[PDB]
Design a protein around this ligand. Structure first.
Ligand SMILES: [Cl-]
Ligand SMILES: [Mn+2]
Ligand code: NA
Length: 129
């Protein structure tokens, strides 16, 4: 599923991401734009053999199982395929654990490089939340 900007903001709000760990909604929407261009089926292989999945490009190195990342962990206890669904529950719940792991949203390299410190409220401006 390819979400529209406001559709995803609303979805994320219902799922408890607004101000989760102090991160306002616009931060999560900005991150999803640059990680996946709002595409739930996005996947990208890393040079280390792990794979990023879903609208927030969660890495099989630590967070989900895909059966082909030797020596990896599965800290969200989910198949990585669950991160590709039109329904964002699995991605949101895993994101919550990730953002609570000590480094906040810096875990998302694209967030740190493209969203952090910017006017993130612009990503939700005009949206009926
Ligand atoms: Cl933080
Ligand atoms: Mn939902
Ligand atoms: Na894994």
């Amino acid at each position: 599923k390819v979400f529209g900007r406001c559709e995803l903001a609303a979805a994320m709000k219902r799922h408890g991401l607004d101000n989760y760990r102090g991160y306002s909604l616009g931060n999560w929407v900005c991150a999803a734009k640059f990680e996946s261009n709002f595409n739930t089926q996005a996947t990208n292989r890393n040079t280390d053999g792990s794979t990023d999945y879903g609208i927030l490009q969660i890495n099989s190195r630590w967070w989900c199982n895909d059966g082909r990342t030797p020596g990896s962990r599965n800290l969200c206890n989910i198949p990585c395929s669950a991160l590709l669904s039109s329904d964002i529950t699995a991605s949101v719940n895993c994101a919550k654990k990730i953002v609570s792991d000590g480094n906040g949203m810096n875990a998302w390299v694209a967030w740190r490089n493209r969203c952090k410190g910017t006017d993130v409220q612009a990503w939700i401006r005009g949206c009926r939340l």
